Amino acid sequence: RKKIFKPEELRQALMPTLEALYRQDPESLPFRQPVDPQLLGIPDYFDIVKNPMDLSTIKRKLDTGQYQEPWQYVDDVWLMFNNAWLYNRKTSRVYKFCSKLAEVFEQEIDPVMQSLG
Numbered sequence: 001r002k003k004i005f006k007p008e009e010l011r012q013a014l015m016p017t018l019e020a021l022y023r024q025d026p027e028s029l030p031f032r033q034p035v036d037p038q039l040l041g042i043p044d045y046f047d048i049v050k051n052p053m054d055l056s057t058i059k060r061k062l063d064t065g066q067y068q069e070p071w072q073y074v075d076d077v078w079l080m081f082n083n084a085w086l087y088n089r090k091t092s093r094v095y096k097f098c099s100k101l102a103e104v105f106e107q108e109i110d111p112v113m114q115s116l117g
């Protein structure tokens, strides 16, 4: 199942799945930039979340060819969702928004991954 991908071929296949998340309004709004614990008054954020991730950083990594293989991109999207579910209470708006994005991503990513082999 080893395959070498060109970064531009990955960017072209995967960026639409990331665009699908950015289009979710308001559910993508918390996810568009890195969590700033100072600005948001959540000083315990980096006690809990040791590997932060957000849409801006994933987009930057696609734009600079830092994903060799499609599973590395999927791992960062899942990291972003797993961090939000870990930090936020199950009852919170951000947790619910995370769950919405995860549903959208599952629908978008499945056929793209099948198409990349």
Ligand SMILES: COc1ccc(N2C(=O)CC[C@H]2c2nc(-c3ccc4onc(C)c4c3)cn2C[C@H](C)N2CCOCC2)cc1Cl
Binding pocket: 026, 029, 030, 031, 035, 040, 042, 083, 084, 087, 088, 093, 094, 097
């Ligand atoms: C419309 O949706 C929102 C509006 C405001 C807020 N916020 C507040 O109620 C207070 C601060 C602000 C806010 N919180 C968070 C927050 C917090 C905990 C988090 O864990 N993981 C993540 C990701 C995460 C994000 C982010 N924000 C900024 C807020 C979403 N703004 C982003 C810029 O456009 C306007 C709305 C959250 C949401 Cl969901």
